[PDB]
Design a protein around this ligand. Structure first.
Ligand SMILES: [K+]
Ligand SMILES: [K+]
Ligand SMILES: [K+]
Ligand SMILES: [K+]
Ligand SMILES: [K+]
Ligand SMILES: [K+]
Ligand SMILES: [Mg+2]
Ligand SMILES: [Mg+2]
Ligand SMILES: [Mg+2]
Ligand SMILES: [Mg+2]
Ligand SMILES: [Mg+2]
Ligand SMILES: [Mg+2]
Ligand SMILES: [Mg+2]
Ligand SMILES: [Mg+2]
Ligand SMILES: [Mg+2]
Ligand SMILES: [Mg+2]
Ligand SMILES: [Mg+2]
Ligand SMILES: [Mg+2]
Ligand SMILES: [Mg+2]
Ligand SMILES: [Mg+2]
Ligand SMILES: [Mg+2]
Ligand SMILES: [Mg+2]
Ligand SMILES: [Mg+2]
Ligand SMILES: [Mg+2]
Ligand SMILES: [Mg+2]
Ligand SMILES: [Mg+2]
Ligand SMILES: [Mg+2]
Ligand SMILES: [Mg+2]
Ligand SMILES: [Mg+2]
Ligand SMILES: [Mg+2]
Ligand SMILES: [Mg+2]
Ligand SMILES: [Mg+2]
Ligand SMILES: [Mg+2]
Ligand SMILES: [Mg+2]
Ligand SMILES: [Mg+2]
Ligand SMILES: [Mg+2]
Ligand SMILES: [Mg+2]
Ligand SMILES: [Mg+2]
Ligand SMILES: [Mg+2]
Ligand SMILES: [Mg+2]
Ligand SMILES: [Mg+2]
Ligand SMILES: [Mg+2]
Ligand SMILES: [Mg+2]
Ligand SMILES: [Mg+2]
Ligand SMILES: [Mg+2]
Ligand SMILES: [Mg+2]
Ligand SMILES: [Mg+2]
Ligand SMILES: [Mg+2]
Ligand SMILES: [Mg+2]
Ligand SMILES: [Mg+2]
Ligand SMILES: [Mg+2]
Ligand SMILES: [Mg+2]
Ligand SMILES: [Mg+2]
Ligand SMILES: [Mg+2]
Ligand SMILES: [Mg+2]
Ligand SMILES: [Mg+2]
Ligand SMILES: [Mg+2]
Ligand SMILES: [Mg+2]
Ligand SMILES: [Mg+2]
Ligand SMILES: [Mg+2]
Ligand SMILES: [Mg+2]
Ligand SMILES: [Mg+2]
Ligand SMILES: [Mg+2]
Ligand SMILES: [Mg+2]
Ligand SMILES: [Mg+2]
Ligand SMILES: [Mg+2]
Ligand SMILES: [Zn+2]
Lengths: 138, 124, 83, 208, 150, 104
RNA sequence: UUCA
RNA sequence: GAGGAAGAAGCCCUUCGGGGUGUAAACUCCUGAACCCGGGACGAAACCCCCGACGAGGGGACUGACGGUACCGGGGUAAUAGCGCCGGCCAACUCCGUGCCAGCAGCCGCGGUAAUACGGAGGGCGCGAGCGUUACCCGGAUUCACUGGGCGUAAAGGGCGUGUAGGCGGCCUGGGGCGUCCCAUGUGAAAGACCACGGCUCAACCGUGGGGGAGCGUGGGAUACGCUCAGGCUAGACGG
RNA sequence: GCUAGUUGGUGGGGUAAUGGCCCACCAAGGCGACGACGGGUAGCCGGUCUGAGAGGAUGGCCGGCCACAGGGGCACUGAG
């Protein structure tokens, strides 16, 4: 089985950026797609788009990076320095609105799945709701 | 361990074993000397440490150390045990309180007198 | 029969009472049903006696029986006045 | 009991001038004059690099020896300050500067903080009119710190208050040499103070 | 300008035919308390020379700490070897709550209010190194902003 | 409000009494994961109306017998031994948790 | 032979 | 308490010139804990009695164990200081006596004739009506790791399968809302804890007021995710 | 692995009152790895101590509830 599709996606993103890929595919799913929008909107990823790799529906995620760098190891600083799955199958994590975390004093973001749709920790706070704490990104 | 396993078995709170079974953990315990031997310490020390077998009121018979320059403990000498290990004397986990009961304080001592039970001497 | 009496609070030689509604059978400084005032027999502050007549009037209306002293404090705080 | 013993010896250990005496700690002789090395048989030997702990401890012993308070008392104040809202450092000094016995000194009714303590205990001092003999009494802003009428004519009160005539006082206070009164206007800021102490190091000493 | 604090000096030993030959190592932190710090670990046959090199290596190992009112702009956990160091932003009046090694780095960097914790291996060397890395990874809203704009 | 529970009938072997199995779901106090717990309540069936596989609502009632403080309120959905199965099989395992075995 |  | 010597005596250390104890003492001058003499409480205003209606109101009288205590005024003597520690951790060093002895020791370790580690002394460091010791709890100890650990060689992968319970579970729709989330609302005794004012000359100790939340009950709402029911799909799986 | 008043039913008895609380008689049931049963220990709580927190440890005094009165058993009198 795959067990945790969302985690699989975060990891493909993590693994790809670590070797500086142009883009990367991830078996497509509505829910996953909602996550991506947040990433795009937040400027963590250039953007994404649906694709039909060999008949099946995927999602090209276009990764972002900093500028080339000085000295040895000119590799660019990452835009997505961290992407961690919080809630997981067999150990779900839910939070009330007053329990929503503040990733890196605001520099980061937390992605919650609320009954008002998928939102960022700020969005959720604004709409005054809580939900499943999907993951954190910074 | 998986969270499931944790839900299944959980963690085990770690207990602590006492270093001084002078029952009730009581700060001190009363006893009567059975023997008042001498003992040789382990490497790399050498000397004749002073020891005593005490028959505690707790129902125990333990070996108590007798600190100080010299002492006055015979057999039926009743005394108070306090518990303090003696590093080079394996087996000795208690000290005898000097200044209580038949155990005389250490005579002539002028410095750490609280220990060794030695009243303050006046001058002129 | 329920009472409107004084419960002791304060310190030694420093009494401070609470006008209270409690069951007659309960300890003096025990669990009371309701607090409805306070008393500083030494009058250490300009405010050494408050009562809340509205509530005290309620308990009396339902059988509350005030102690002689509880009664005097209550009176002094216009509880029984009717003019 | 608050210390009571050779004092111009504590100055020497701290390697800094502690005006515990006052009148003599001014006229070239507080020992810190031609003998600024710590007391003892080894006092003149080179010292070794003090350990961080050592440095925090000495600094704390310095600040605390200034107000001549006990560790017990001193500590409680620090704690009260750690709780209180706001920088738990300046506040701490503020609290110390509010001790009656200290204010009595800052207004010059007494020459030293030691001499100022006795003046309070012996009841020669008054806050807002009432007598107060509690050195540790905390003076709040607005309070008036005078001298007992029955004391205004004391050999010592005259002499000290005399010499105060013409001299200026702490920005946060205000003397009235004539009537021997004074007012604690406001808690002094660290800026108002100016003692040889590095408050932070004291906070650090109590974090260990 | 640059203030120097010595973290630790140690006498190491190598073995030779007939007897053991010694050498010293010294860790030195340098900073302006204005946002610049540098670490240096110098080694030489004598303590003084050791500290000399220490200082030297340090000045060429400077880091730009983004102070924001005496504190850090956000928490960072950095692992160096088996040593892990945690740095948390604190408000004014907190001071620098940290162990001797990370404290020195931090103060000389001009940090005045910070919360920290040493986890795992407390090797001064590796902790000293974990700290520098932590400071080095610190980012600012601005920086995040440029990373995500484009 | 009298508590109303919902469970499956896993025993109609008592004269006017059905055993209802009620399942609870909730976050584990320390580890968080949502664990599942459950209990069997003996309810009142005067009419011997309800039967195995029956999913019912049980309501807090005035004592009827020792350890029988519930009356059956209504039927939610009839027949469905898939539930009584899990229950029955589970109890079967117990035969193989003693001194002997029970295959697999 | 033991302790450095 | 203020003053008080380029700094008695004694004791300690000395290169022997001198250095310590040390403004410490002595003394000079101030202030007066204890004491002595006066005054002397609040806590107690009801029950009751008279008027009026045995009401509301209004008068009146009795009653203090603590206590002659608290406090107030007058007079008024310089008037207890101990205990632990000084190798590193850990603030604080010298002389002598001891000779792996006598002994110290929380851990690391000290003593075998030049011991800052033993015993004494001088000096020093901490606290100070206390200091120390023993015992027990939490801490540091992410050293049972939920936050927050691990298992190739450090303690740790079951000798290998099969498979029961259980845990977990791909892509779309739609019901239901059990988990979850949101709003109301009941409950959440008093003390205590936090904050703000107050009362004992301070404080300790007290009062008075204020704020607070999890949990659970009830009503109403949301449906992304997990759950459940119903359709569907073919990338997982199995089969030809 | 435990169970015979054991689990349930009818009727009764008893009580302020429900109830195998007790009794007749009928049914074979009831509980258990989501541990029953057995053993060890222990009054529970508001709260206390510690801890950054999560936790850990705890009930002395004070307030709430429970239990007991040399050890067992039992009713009587009463609103209790
Ligand atoms: K790493
Ligand atoms: K069985
Ligand atoms: K009247
Ligand atoms: K010595
Ligand atoms: K511990
Ligand atoms: K508890
Ligand atoms: Mg990541
Ligand atoms: Mg919740
Ligand atoms: Mg013992
Ligand atoms: Mg031997
Ligand atoms: Mg030896
Ligand atoms: Mg010990
Ligand atoms: Mg030994
Ligand atoms: Mg009555
Ligand atoms: Mg009663
Ligand atoms: Mg009662
Ligand atoms: Mg503060
Ligand atoms: Mg060295
Ligand atoms: Mg930068
Ligand atoms: Mg490396
Ligand atoms: Mg590691
Ligand atoms: Mg370790
Ligand atoms: Mg029945
Ligand atoms: Mg019905
Ligand atoms: Mg041989
Ligand atoms: Mg040896
Ligand atoms: Mg003097
Ligand atoms: Mg009176
Ligand atoms: Mg009449
Ligand atoms: Mg009349
Ligand atoms: Mg009247
Ligand atoms: Mg009377
Ligand atoms: Mg007088
Ligand atoms: Mg030292
Ligand atoms: Mg000793
Ligand atoms: Mg005291
Ligand atoms: Mg722990
Ligand atoms: Mg352990
Ligand atoms: Mg873990
Ligand atoms: Mg480990
Ligand atoms: Mg191994
Ligand atoms: Mg294997
Ligand atoms: Mg093996
Ligand atoms: Mg299998
Ligand atoms: Mg299965
Ligand atoms: Mg699914
Ligand atoms: Mg719901
Ligand atoms: Mg609520
Ligand atoms: Mg409460
Ligand atoms: Mg006050
Ligand atoms: Mg309150
Ligand atoms: Mg389907
Ligand atoms: Mg009946
Ligand atoms: Mg009946
Ligand atoms: Mg029965
Ligand atoms: Mg019956
Ligand atoms: Mg169960
Ligand atoms: Mg018991
Ligand atoms: Mg902690
Ligand atoms: Mg912890
Ligand atoms: Mg408990
Ligand atoms: Mg009994
Ligand atoms: Mg008895
Ligand atoms: Mg009897
Ligand atoms: Mg009995
Ligand atoms: Mg009666
Ligand atoms: Zn001075």
């Amino acid at each position: 089985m795959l067990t945790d599709p969302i985690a699989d996606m975060l990891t493909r993103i993590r693994n790809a950026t670590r070797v500086y890929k142009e883009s990367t595919d991830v078996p497509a799913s509505r829910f996953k797609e909602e996550i991506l929008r947040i990433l795009a909107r937040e400027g963590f990823i250039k953007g994404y788009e649906r694709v039909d790799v060999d008949g099946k529906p995927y999602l090209r995620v276009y990764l972002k990076y900093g500028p080339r760098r000085q000295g040895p190891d000119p590799r660019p600083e990452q835009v997505i320095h961290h992407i961690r799955r919080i809630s997981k199958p067999g150990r779900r994590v839910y939070v009330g609105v007053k329990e929503i975390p503040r990733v890196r004093r605001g520099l980061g973001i937390a992605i919650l799945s609320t009954s008002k749709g998928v939102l960022t920790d700020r969005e959720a706070r604004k709409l005054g709701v809580g939900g499943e704490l999907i993951c954190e990104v910074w | 361990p998986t969270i499931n396993q944790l839900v299944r078995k959980g963690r085990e709170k770690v207990r602590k074993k006492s270093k001084v079974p002078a029952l009730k953990g009581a700060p001190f315990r009363r006893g009567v000397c059975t023997v008042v031997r001498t003992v040789t310490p382990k490497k790399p020390n050498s000397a004749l440490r002073k020891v005593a077998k005490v028959r505690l009121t707790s129902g125990y018979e333990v070996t108590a150390y007798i600190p100080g320059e010299g002492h006055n403990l015979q057999e039926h000498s009743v005394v108070l045990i306090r518990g303090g290990r003696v590093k080079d004397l394996p087996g000795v986990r208690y000290h005898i309180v000097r200044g209580v009961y038949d155990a005389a304080g250490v005579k002539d001592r002028k410095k750490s007198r609280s220990k060794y039970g030695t009243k303050k001497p006046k001058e002129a | 029969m329920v009472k409107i009496r004084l419960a002791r609070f304060g310190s030694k030689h420093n009494p401070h009472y609470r006008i209270v509604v409690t069951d007659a059978r309960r300890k003096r400084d025990g669990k009371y049903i309701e607090k409805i005032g306070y008393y500083d027999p030494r009058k250490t502050t300009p405010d050494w006696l408050k009562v809340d007549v509205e509530r005290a009037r309620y308990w009396l209306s339902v059988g509350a029986q005030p102690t002689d002293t509880a009664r005097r404090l209550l009176r002094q705080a216009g509880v029984f006045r009717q003019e | 009991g608050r210390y009571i013993g050779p004092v111009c010896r504590l100055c020497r250990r701290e390697g800094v001038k502690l005006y515990l005496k006052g009148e003599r700690c001014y006229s070239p002789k507080c020992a810190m004059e031609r003998r600024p090395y710590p007391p003892g048989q080894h006092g003149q030997k080179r010292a070794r690099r003090p350990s961080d702990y050592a440095v925090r401890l000495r600094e704390k012993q310095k600040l605390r020896r200034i107000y001549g308070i006990s560790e017990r008392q001193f500590r409680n104040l620090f704690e009260e300050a750690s709780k209180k809202k706001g920088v738990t450092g300046s506040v701490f000094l503020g609290l110390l500067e509010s001790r009656l016995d200290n204010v009595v000194y800052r207004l010059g009714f007494a020459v030293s903080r030691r001499q100022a303590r006795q003046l309070v205990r012996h009841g020669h001092i008054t806050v807002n009119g009432r007598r107060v003999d509690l050195p540790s009494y905390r003076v709040r802003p607005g309070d008036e710190i005078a001298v007992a009428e029955k004391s205004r004519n004391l050999e010592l009160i005259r002499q000290n208050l005399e010499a105060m005539k013409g001299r200026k006082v702490g920005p946060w206070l205000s003397l009235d040499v004539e009537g021997m009164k004074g007012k604690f206007l406001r808690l002094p800021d660290r800026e108002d103070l100016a003692l040889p102490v590095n408050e932070q190091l004291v906070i650090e000493f109590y974090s260990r | 300008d640059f203030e120097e604090k010595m973290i630790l000096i140690r006498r190491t030993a190598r073995m030779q035919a007939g007897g053991r030959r010694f050498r010293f190592g010294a860790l030195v932190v340098v900073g302006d308390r204005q946002g610049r710090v540098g670490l240096g670990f110098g080694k030489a046959p004598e303590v003084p020379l050791a500290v000399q090199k220490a200082g030297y290596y340090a000045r060429r190992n400077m880091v730009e700490v983004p102070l924001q009112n005496g504190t850090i702009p956000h928490e960072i956990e950095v692992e160096f070897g088996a040593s892990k160091i945690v740095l948390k932003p604190a408000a004014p009046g907190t001071g620098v709550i940290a162990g001797a090694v990370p404290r020195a780095i931090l103060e000389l960097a001009g940090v005045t209010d910070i919360l920290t914790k040493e986890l795992g291996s407390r090797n001064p060397i590796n902790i000293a190194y974990a700290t520098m890395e932590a400071l080095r990874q610190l980012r600012t809203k601005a920086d995040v902003e440029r990373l995500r704009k484009g | 409000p009298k508590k109303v529970l919902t469970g499956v009938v896993v025993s109609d072997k008592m004269q006017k009494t059905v055993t209802v199995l009620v399942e609870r779901q909730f976050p584990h106090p320390l580890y968080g994961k949502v664990i599942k717990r459950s209990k069997k309540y003996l309810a009142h069936d005067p009419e011997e109306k309800y039967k195995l596989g029956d999913v019912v609502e049980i309501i807090e009632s005035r004592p009827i017998s020792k350890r029988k403080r519930f009356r059956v309120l209504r039927l939610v959905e009839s027949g469905r031994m898939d539930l009584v199965e899990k229950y029955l099989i589970r109890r079967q395992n117990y035969q193989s948790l003693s001194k002997r075995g029970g295959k697999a």
